[PDB]
Amino acid sequence: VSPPPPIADEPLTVNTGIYLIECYSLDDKAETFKVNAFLSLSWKDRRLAFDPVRSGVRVKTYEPEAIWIPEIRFVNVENARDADVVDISVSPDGTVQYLERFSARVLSPLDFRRYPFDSQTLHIYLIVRSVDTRNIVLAVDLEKVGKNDDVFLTGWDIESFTAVVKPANFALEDRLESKLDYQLRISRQYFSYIPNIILPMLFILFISWTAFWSTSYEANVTLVVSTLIAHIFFNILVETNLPKTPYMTYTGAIIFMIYLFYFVAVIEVTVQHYLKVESQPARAASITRASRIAFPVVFLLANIILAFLFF
Amino acid sequence: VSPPPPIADEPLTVNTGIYLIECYSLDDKAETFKVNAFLSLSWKDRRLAFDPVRSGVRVKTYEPEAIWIPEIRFVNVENARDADVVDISVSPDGTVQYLERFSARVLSPLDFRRYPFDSQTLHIYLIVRSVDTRNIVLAVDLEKVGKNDDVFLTGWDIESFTAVVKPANFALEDRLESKLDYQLRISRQYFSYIPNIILPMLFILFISWTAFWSTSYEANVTLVVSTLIAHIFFNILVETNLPKTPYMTYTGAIIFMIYLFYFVAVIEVTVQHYLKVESQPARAASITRASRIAFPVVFLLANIILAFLFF
Amino acid sequence: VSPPPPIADEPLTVNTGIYLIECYSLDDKAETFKVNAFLSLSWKDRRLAFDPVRSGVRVKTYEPEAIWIPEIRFVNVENARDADVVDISVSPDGTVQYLERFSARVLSPLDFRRYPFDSQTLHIYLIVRSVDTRNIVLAVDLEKVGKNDDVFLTGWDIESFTAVVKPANFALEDRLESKLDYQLRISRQYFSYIPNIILPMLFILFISWTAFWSTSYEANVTLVVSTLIAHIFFNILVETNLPKTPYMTYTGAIIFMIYLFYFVAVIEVTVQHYLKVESQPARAASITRASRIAFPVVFLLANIILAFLFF
Amino acid sequence: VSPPPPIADEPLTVNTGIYLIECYSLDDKAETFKVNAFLSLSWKDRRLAFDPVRSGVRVKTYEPEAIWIPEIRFVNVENARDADVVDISVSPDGTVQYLERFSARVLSPLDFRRYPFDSQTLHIYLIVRSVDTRNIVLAVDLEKVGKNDDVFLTGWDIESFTAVVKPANFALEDRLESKLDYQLRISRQYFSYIPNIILPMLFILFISWTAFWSTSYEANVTLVVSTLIAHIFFNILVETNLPKTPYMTYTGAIIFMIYLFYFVAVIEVTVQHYLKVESQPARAASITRASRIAFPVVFLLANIILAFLFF
Amino acid sequence: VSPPPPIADEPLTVNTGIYLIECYSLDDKAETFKVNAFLSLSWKDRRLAFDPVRSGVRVKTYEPEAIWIPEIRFVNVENARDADVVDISVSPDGTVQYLERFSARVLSPLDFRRYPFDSQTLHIYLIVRSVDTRNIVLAVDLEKVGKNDDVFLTGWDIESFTAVVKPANFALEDRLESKLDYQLRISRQYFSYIPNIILPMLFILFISWTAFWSTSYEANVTLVVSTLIAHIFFNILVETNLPKTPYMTYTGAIIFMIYLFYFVAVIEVTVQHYLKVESQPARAASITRASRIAFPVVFLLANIILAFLFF
């Protein structure tokens, strides 16, 4: 067993396909997802050709170890995939049809910039390294790229599974390597973030602004500091579900900005009280009266600016 | 070793049965559960037939590798199941009786809409792919579908384990595939949610309403904001036990609605105080007096509406 | 290799023994524990007889694959146990002595009703399924059931490891199955729950009752609501260490009841204040004075009632 | 392949050594640690000797399966160790030198009594069970017990790795078993506990005592209850890092005692207020004045008493 | 199969190369990271040479078991690496080119002193132990050390992957061992720590200082104690992401210092109130007036001092 030799001096073309059976565990923090799929491989091995009329049979079967099979590997996996050879068929002209069912944990970076209203392109990169007697090159048989209808990935919507047809061919340690890019396009179901995080977070913020209709320092200090604490909780909660990025994320920005609002609210609450103690309630009164409008307005303007920058 | 050929031109029928020995780890978040069971397979392989008389035994035993065994696989598993062949028996006319004990982690979506008063239908999908010389088709031998009496699944009640007798047959990459649907019907034991989450959550809400019998702004602000914080804790707790759904869940809705109650309570507490400072306690007095009735009543009406929509 | 045939028409008796070397990870939530032990099997196989004289050796040693070994399996495990055959001895008469060292994760329900003052009976169920040529039946060789002295199971006291000598024999999918029940009796070391949970929880409750010696509504509201929150924390803590049961647990009940005390305390604090504002401190005074006695007394009575119901 | 027979009637001595390459994951809760090391075995097998002069080779090599190797196993591991045979050398007189590299997860109880100022003795117990034709006995070749210089175990200081030279020999299920005790002496680096837990915990306690310089009930109640809550947080934090012991631990005791201080502080705060409302500020005044001294003094005395009892 | 013998009496040189394909899971707490890479080995084995001419081949291929392959192992791994031999080539003069793809979990200490503005040098140590017939020595073929462009390690920037060319040779249990040090230089992306932890932590501290512009003891006590609690939360959060070090870390120091500020603020708040009650507001007034400047100034000075000591 060793590679089938060139008729002329052409590279060996291995036709590939991936057909997703299952998708699970898209782990945002680790930036990985698990996949369970059929991997199909096809290539011409002439040493294996036979006659259809005299052979009586129109297709022949083989056990993995009996014939040469190209070593296809995934680039971005954690560990070598788990594979069960399902079937190997050889037709008269010596065309081999290989089919395996595999499962793997795939590494694939996510762009958290628009979280939780983001979309991602997961990748599964197939690769093959040329042997000494000949160069192996990959291709996509579109007929065999797909996914079953039930493939659901919790908390995500699956848009499409397609392969970039043209391999990237390059040299790696003095041998040719042929690599294919299968893409799984998904978008996050942001729905639940609304009632679980966003609204509660806004509610507590608005509750903080009631201090602008109160002349009680002690009350205000309680309103503002208490809610600020609840905000910290949401901040901590949100940040435990994301990995640490070197860029601001949309939610990250809103969350951060909101601290600025609490800080300024505290200042206002402080100033108002100070003026009152210093026997000048009228300045205090008009600073608070202004704040009742400024706060919601600037909060609204700042958010529009952010949504614009981010979307 | 290769498939037994047709007497006429019929498909090969593989009779299947699953018999649950253990059920554990129904993981709500991941939407998976673990199973440990017997898988039984039966089919006719004539090349194995024999005369009871000349051979002096009514049954014949084999080791897996010695005979053709159909490749049955589960659709919705994470990894290829863990299997020990328990026994392979062949009777005179060449009927094979295969028995394996396996364990697997099964993917199966849950409908969280009525959590925690929900019921689910877990599925185990058996599948087989036709080979080139013939089509394989699955069937359920009801005699061999079951579960032992001790099979308990923590925090769930097991209603039934049955198979949909008629396989779904379809083409997948130009070969016929025969798939069976075994169903495990369970319902969640909602009992503990009552004292651990529901009642405590109601208690803190009712405590908030005592603010309606208090003319102390500072006190009220403390009652309302404090309890609101405890509510956030229950909210966070509850949401860490569920996955993120693109639909409102029953508990989710109650939890969310309750925030609305805290927000409105804060407004009332604010308005009441404001009016009092502005030297009009009588309007304040009657807004509070109304609230004592409105709050509980609207809370009760809103809940009836929800239970109706959800159940 | 296939079962040894009957002298008369008796079943084949396999003598078993389990000798615990290690016990760890009793996981309350998952209801499992890990075990590491010797499994010993003995049975007559006459086909293996030999003459010490004509073979030089008093005992023969065999390698697993060389002889028939009965397929013993555990019922309540997650995955097929991890086994290393330690030794296989055959005495001339053909008695086989088999010794393996295994490790497994065992499923075994716990009764949380008296937590954390509970005791449990863990089970390890050995099983064997009869083959076609003969029935296999299990037995306990008490001489070989035990555990080493150092076997410690963190946070539990080990009472005893014994086997129920009489197998349960029954039919399962048309073959006889012989099952043995090994029992590991343990009791939880409740000690630490005292300083870590119980006492702190009582301290915070008693602290709340100081509100009964205070005429300050604002103070009281703080005492009662604050401690109520700390109670919620202990409640959450406790419930993260237990699985969800369809029955009230002892701690669960105490924890729940205590909420009732906080709720009633809030009412009292509310009533007292209300009356005071309404210019009737004398009724208030005597409601508070009553509460100072009622609360501790009813708390004590209710606890005695519970301990009685639970123990 | 079977044991080498006695020249006289002596037991077979297997010389052992463990050389630590890596130490990691000392998990306090689970009471385990992971080890990666060389295991060396040596024994005389005469059937394997040869001529030094005639052969021209000073030593000779074998593959594991070609010769008898004694079955050495670890007592206190979770699963059978992971082993790669590195090399097997046989010298002229038939002395075999075996060397493997293994990794294992070792169970070994810790004494938490002085946490976090504790020291531990981890154990790795080698064992061998005698065969029928002869008794195997273990010994330590000190020349081959050691650890490399870089072996660092996070958050612990490594004192020494030594073996108790004399095996413990005993009968277990009617065969002799020879067991060796390798000891790894470590001591916890308590440093970080100081700024992360101990000091913060003291700071919050001292902050509570400022209530003794305040005549404001409402303020005090806030100081004392707030800090008590922060104490609960540290308590919870600390207890999540330790397993549950049936004995008080040093930190456990300090933590517990401190609750007593909060409880008594609350009483004092209550009494002081009560007396003040009852128009007797002078008794109140002298109870508070006493408390300013009593609290710190009794806290200091109690701690000295504890350190004495524990150290 | 056994080592190729010396032409003269030279050691056998094994040329090595590591080419990173993937980097993930740098786990700060455990001090490990996962790697997926090509490992290339090359050495001269004369027994394998051939004449290019009477063979009609430039190179020859082999299966692992057919030829001698040096046992290269990693020092600092948890478990023996997962390896797939990709290809083995032998050129005419008997030079072997071996290529495997492996994945492993590597142990490698981190210096947390400047967290989160730290840089680290991860190591992968290749090793080989000499056999009896000859000494094996490692070397780096720089041509084959590298990493692919996409190698991203979440939350870290990858600076470089180089090997220290000169092996460290030493004796270990009476055999020579040759060890190589591959270094992966990374630096932490500190960006997110700014908005998620640092700033929030400063905001709450500054909010505490508003107490210096308030004459309300009750208010102040709330401001100072509340924020102190939020600080504890950030402290706990931060410390759950780091392992426990025997040295102060930069963040650790800032965090600790800040407690000192809260403690002193509480004292000031206490003193101010005390003086006020004692009818001397003017001393109080000037202590508070001083604090408004002292606090921020000393906080700023202390930070400059720390950054200096740490950076």
UniProtKB/Swiss-Prot annotation, chains A, B, C, D, E:
The outcome of changing residue 226 to A is: Increases the binding affinity of TBA
Q: One GO CC annotation, please?
A: plasma membrane
Query: Which residue stretches are annotated as topological domain Periplasmic?
Result: 1-189, 241-248
Q: Does the keyword Transmembrane helix apply?
A: yes
- Chain ranges on the Cytoplasmic side, renumbered to this chain: 213-215, 278-280
Q: Which UniProt keywords apply?
A: Cell inner membrane, Cell membrane, Ion channel, Ion transport, Ligand-gated ion channel, Membrane, Potassium, Potassium channel, Potassium transport, Receptor, Signal, Sodium, Sodium channel, Sodium transport, Transmembrane, Transmembrane helix, Transport
Q: What is the effect of changing residue 251 to A?
A: Marked gain of function, with a ten-fold shift of the proton dose-response curve towards lower concentrations. Also shows slower apparent rate constants for activation and deactivation
* Record Pfam families: Neur_chan_LBD
Please indicate if the UniProt record lists Chaperone as a keyword. Answer: no
Question: Altering residue 238 to M: what's the impact?
Answer: Displays an increased sensitivity to propofol but not to desflurane
Subcellular location, record wording? Cell inner membrane
Q: How is its activity regulated?
A: Tetraethylammonium (TEA) and tetrabutylammonium (TBA) inhibit the proton-activated currents in a dose- and voltage-dependent manner in vitro, whereas the blocker of acid sensing ion channels, amiloride, has no effect. Channel current of GLIC can be inhibited by inhaled and intravenous general anesthetics at and below concentrations used clinically. Ion conduction is also inhibited by lidocaine and by divalent transition metal ions such as cadmium ions.
Extract one GO molecular function annotation from the record: potassium channel activity
Q: What does this protein do?
A: Cationic channel with similar permeabilities for Na(+) and K(+), that is activated by an increase of the proton concentration on the extracellular side. Displays no permeability for chloride ions. Shows slow kinetics of activation, no desensitization and a single channel conductance of 8 pS. Might contribute to adaptation to external pH change.
Q: What is known of its domains?
A: Consists of an N-terminal ligand-binding domain that encloses a wide aqueous vestibule and a transmembrane domain that forms a narrow channel.
- Protein name as catalogued: Proton-gated ion channel
The organism encoding this protein is: Gloeobacter violaceus (strain ATCC 29082 / PCC 7421)
